A paper describes a structure:
Several studies have demonstrated that P. gingivalis employs the Type IX secretion system (T9SS) to translocate gingipains across the outer membrane (OM). Furthermore, sequence analysis revealed that PorE is a lipoprotein anchored in the OM through N-terminal acylation, and is composed of four domains, from N to C-terminal: a tetratricopeptide repeats domain, a five bladed β-propeller domain, a predicted carboxypeptidase regulatory domain-like fold, and an OmpA_C-like domain. In the same study, it was shown that PorE is essential for T9SS function.
The four molecules present in the asymmetric unit form a tightly packed tetramer that is predicted to be stable in solution by the PDBe PISA server (calculated buried area: 11560 Å2). However, this oligomerization state results from a crystallization artefact as Size-Exclusion Chromatography Multi-Angle Light Scattering (SEC-MALS) analysis indicated that the protein in solution is monomeric with a molecular weight of 17.7 kDa. The surface of the OmpA_C-like domain displays a narrow and deep cavity in which extra electron density was readily visible allowing the building of a naturally-occurring fragment of PG containing four residues of the stem peptide, L-Ala-γ-D-Glu-meso-DAP-D-Ala.
Author numbering: -19 to -1, 534 to 668
Write the structure that this text describes.
């Protein structure tokens, strides 16, 4: 099969790539911002250039509001991405998705840590981590949790 031990995955959770970005959302919205459409066009290029690969997506919500509500919101966030891709010709069978609600806070990557003096690589944006922060710091963290993650798979 593969003639080597596992290498680095092309995904948004562990590493930062200019050409494979997280999708971020407004508070209580599943809408694709103009920036999100550019990011999805970059993903469509990867899908069309590599016709056999699939994309696994995971959609999320920030700590505010009930668990069940946030699960539904995360499903709508995944669906908006799937609908944009399928509207551009991507076969639905090439995409898998899961809505995690607010159950999986994001881990701060080296790029996120470079951009914010208060965040360090490896910090997990849990409710307990975000709770004692300033209103501005909470807004940065909550925004980072309102995202869709991607991973390129077979
Ligand atoms: C049990 O779980 C909830 C309550 C549920 O599943 N009910 C659904 C059907 C529902 O419609 N509930 C909402 C809950 C509204 C809510 O809590 N919204 C969140 C939205 C949070 C979104 C956020 N977590 C994100 O990731 O964008 C929130 O915190 N809003 C507050 C009041 C606010 O506006 O600041 C309603 O009453 O309209
Ligand atoms: Na930092």
């Amino acid at each position: 099969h593969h003639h080597h031990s596992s290498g680095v995955d092309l995904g948004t959770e562990n590493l930062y790539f200019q050409s494979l970005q997280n999708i971020f959302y407004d508070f209580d919205k599943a809408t694709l911002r103009p920036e999100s459409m550019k990011s999805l066009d970059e993903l469509i290029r990867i899908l069309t250039d590599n016709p056999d690969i699939r994309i696994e997506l995971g959609s999320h919500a920030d700590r505010k509001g009930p668990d069940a509500y946030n699960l539904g919101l995360s499903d709508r966030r995944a669906k908006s991405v799937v609908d944009y891709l399928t509207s551009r010709g991507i076969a639905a069978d090439r995409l898998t998705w899961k809505g995690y609600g607010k159950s999986v806070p994001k881990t701060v990557t080296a790029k996120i840590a470079e951009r914010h003096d208060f965040l360090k690589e490896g910090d997990v944006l849990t409710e307990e981590f975000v709770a004692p922060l300033t209103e501005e710091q909470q807004s940065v963290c909550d925004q980072l949790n309102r995202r869709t993650e991607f991973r390129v798979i077979e």
